[PDB]
Amino acid sequence: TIKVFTTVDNINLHTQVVDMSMTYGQQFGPTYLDGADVTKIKPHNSHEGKTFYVLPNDDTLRVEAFEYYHTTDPSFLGRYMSALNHTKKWKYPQVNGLTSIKWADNNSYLATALLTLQQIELKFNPPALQDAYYRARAGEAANFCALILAYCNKTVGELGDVRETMSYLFQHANLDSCKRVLNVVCKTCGQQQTTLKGVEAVMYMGTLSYEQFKKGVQIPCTCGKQATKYLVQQESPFVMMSAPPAQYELKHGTFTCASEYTGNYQCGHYKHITSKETLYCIDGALLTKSSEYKGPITDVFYKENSYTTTIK
Numbered sequence: 001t002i003k004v005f006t007t008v009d010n011i012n013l014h015t016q017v018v019d020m021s022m023t024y025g026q027q028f029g030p031t032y033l034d035g036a037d038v039t040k041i042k043p044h045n046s047h048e049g050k051t052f053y054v055l056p057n058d059d060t061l062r063v064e065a066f067e068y069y070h071t072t073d074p075s076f077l078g079r080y081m082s083a084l085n086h087t088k089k090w091k092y093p094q095v096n097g098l099t100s101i102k103w104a105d106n107n108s109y110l111a112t113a114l115l116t117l118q119q120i121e122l123k124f125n126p127p128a129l130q131d132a133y134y135r136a137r138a139g140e141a142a143n144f145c146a147l148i149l150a151y152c153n154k155t156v157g158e159l160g161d162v163r164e165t166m167s168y169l170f171q172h173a174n175l176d177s178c179k180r181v182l183n184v185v186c187k188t189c190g191q192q193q194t195t196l197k198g199v200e201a202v203m204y205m206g207t208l209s210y211e212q213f214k215k216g217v218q219i220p221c222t223c224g225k226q227a228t229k230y231l232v233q234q235e236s237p238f239v240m241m242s243a244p245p246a247q248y249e250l251k252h253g254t255f256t257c258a259s260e261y262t263g264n265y266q267c268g269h270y271k272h273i274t275s276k277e278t279l280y281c282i283d284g285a286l287l288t289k290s291s292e293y294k295g296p297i298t299d300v301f302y303k304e305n306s307y308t309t310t311i312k
């Protein structure tokens, strides 16, 4: 018998005395060591005193798991640990003062999301995500990346979309203050305002231009005609404008950052463009700069606080 610490959150630790003859599994159920599944493994001497994640198997641990992760999904832990087993081997170089990810395991979308998250104002509701976000920002992003995979229901190597990933993370964030008022104007039906809150207040799919959204865009009306959707009022610290990739000109100082996407649906490559004193293009570990940019953009992020249109 050695003694170990079991946990679900790596905050509340529980002392166990484990049989050196019995597997971890026989004694605790599914058991992980820094991401690596050790259910079917017996305890080695150098395991003495270390901390293992266990699957919750009593009320105390289920409550601590919900309080840390904001999920009761029993697969969540195993998916988090399977992802961490890879993300702990990725490299996280600082590029232009941001934690990036050196390319591995089709991670371009995760690196682009990670870089974006360091440039917009967001508070995560699950303490697991908030703690890992602070650690990632200071250069240790392995846990954060594994949690992004677990929360998005994605595995390492799976092809991912930055807009879809940001959408899932925003659903785990405090965006309640965020408010969007839209006006739709049709010839026949007339004018209808609607108010959106939370995630739907900060995301739009259909144009990259925040300015064009303010001037209005042409959308189908239930009557059958085209109509004009325009932005009446925005209350959020940022907005995310997305569209199917298309050649687009990015101007220094007119946006926060953007997702570049090159190639076919699903199996292309993301890079990240950020507006500093000049335009930086972050491609995992690679960095280029230029004063101008035109290329295939699918997401553009902008700063906001309070906007009210000058349209009656």
Ligand SMILES: C=CC(=O)Nc1ccc(C)c(C(=O)N[C@H](C)c2cccc3ccccc23)c1
Binding pocket: 159, 160, 161, 164, 243, 244, 245, 261, 263, 264, 265, 266, 267, 268, 298
């Ligand atoms: C829901 C299923 C799904 O697999 N989604 C998903 C997963 C992973 C990726 C990389 C993408 C994706 O290719 N995203 C880019 C940005 C994209 C977005 C929209 C329209 C597009 C049209 C042409 C080309 C790219 C287009 C989508």
Ligand SMILES: [Cl-]
Binding pocket: 006, 007, 008, 009, 010, 011, 012, 013, 061, 064
């Ligand atoms: Cl715990």
Ligand SMILES: [Cl-]
Binding pocket: 070, 071
């Ligand atoms: Cl929740």
Ligand SMILES: [Cl-]
Binding pocket: 070, 125, 126, 171, 172, 173
């Ligand atoms: Cl949540």
Ligand SMILES: [Zn+2]
Binding pocket: 012, 013, 014, 060, 061, 064
């Ligand atoms: Zn406990």
Ligand SMILES: [Zn+2]
Binding pocket: 070, 125, 126, 172
């Ligand atoms: Zn929650």
Ligand SMILES: [Zn+2]
Binding pocket: 086, 105, 156
């Ligand atoms: Zn891997």
Ligand SMILES: [Zn+2]
Binding pocket: 186, 187, 188, 189, 190, 221, 222, 223, 224, 225
């Ligand atoms: Zn109508």
